[PDB]
Amino acid sequence: WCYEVQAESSNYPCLVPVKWGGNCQKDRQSPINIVTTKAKVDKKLGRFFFSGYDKKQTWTVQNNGHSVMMLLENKASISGGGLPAPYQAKQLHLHWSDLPYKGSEHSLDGEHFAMEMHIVHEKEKGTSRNVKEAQDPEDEIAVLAFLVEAGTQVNEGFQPLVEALSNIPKPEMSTTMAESSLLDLLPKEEKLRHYFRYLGSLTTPTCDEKVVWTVFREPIQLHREQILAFSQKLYYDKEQTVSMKDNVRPLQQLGQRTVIKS
Ligand SMILES: [Zn+2]
Numbered sequence: 001w002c003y004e005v006q007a008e009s010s011n012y013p014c015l016v017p018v019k020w021g022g023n024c025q026k027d028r029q030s031p032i033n034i035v036t037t038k039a040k041v042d043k044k045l046g047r048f049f050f051s052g053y054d055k056k057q058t059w060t061v062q063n064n065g066h067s068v069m070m071l072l073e074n075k076a077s078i079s080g081g082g083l084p085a086p087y088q089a090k091q092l093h094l095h096w097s098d099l100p101y102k103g104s105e106h107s108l109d110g111e112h113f114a115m116e117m118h119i120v121h122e123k124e125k126g127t128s129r130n131v132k133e134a135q136d137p138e139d140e141i142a143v144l145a146f147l148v149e150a151g152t153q154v155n156e157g158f159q160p161l162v163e164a165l166s167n168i169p170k171p172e173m174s175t176t177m178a179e180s181s182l183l184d185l186l187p188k189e190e191k192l193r194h195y196f197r198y199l200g201s202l203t204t205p206t207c208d209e210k211v212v213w214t215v216f217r218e219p220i221q222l223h224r225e226q227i228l229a230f231s232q233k234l235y236y237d238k239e240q241t242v243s244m245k246d247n248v249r250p251l252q253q254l255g256q257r258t259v260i261k262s
Pocket residue numbers: 093095118203
């Protein structure tokens with residue numbers, strides 16, 4: 001499967017977003033545009049609690065041909081934020097572009113940002129459900145999304161990741177980034193108080209609708225050069241001819257769903 005941009009310049013067939021298979025053609029898809037003013041306020045949406053997010057550590061990061069992804073190996077978890085139970089971190093990856101107004105999947109009141117970061121987690125234990133219900137739990141996977149925009153200061157917390165890119169230009173490559181903690185990436189805990197919530201799917205095949213999304217309103221800031229690093233050092237093909245950018249899924253319709261916030 002492919003993103004539009006790469007389908008045009010690829011040397012072999014591939015399904016574009018509108019022609020994706022799986023549950024990608026269903027009714028509870030992501031990303032969506034969030035009309036901040038239409039989202040209902042909910043008190044049950046308390047703050048989140050992080051475990052392991054602060055310990056420096058080496059991570060395995062890799063170029064899967066669709067994005068840059070670092071494996072989290074259940075070495076951290078979250079709770080609170082209205083979540084019915086703890087969720088352990090599996091992986092993290094990003095979506096970006098070289099133009100400041102078209103790098104994120106979700107949008108706020110029609111505005112798109114430089115990049116978007118997805119931290120995927122899965123429900124801790126298994127809870128009893130009835131056979132008659134939907135096969136997969138609608139809140140099975142919990143992802144945290146952060147919007148990224150250009151700033152003046154060089155973001156030191158992202159430096160290790162940016163460096164690592166040099167070692168994985170082509171697909172299938174891997175490496176070990178310098179010791180860092182997940183907390184080094186996110187903004188200060190006090191800014192993580194406001195966020196939007198809604199049920200949806202994954203933004204890649206098979207687009208399974210078993211995700212509880214969380215989009216924080218506070219954007220992470222990176223120096224322009226740091227953002228461009230991704231487009232400049234990563235490639236979609238082994239021949240190193242097509243830069244990796246615009247790896248974003250076109251918006252989907254909200255439908256019967258409603259969004260709530262804190
Ligand atoms: Zn993603």
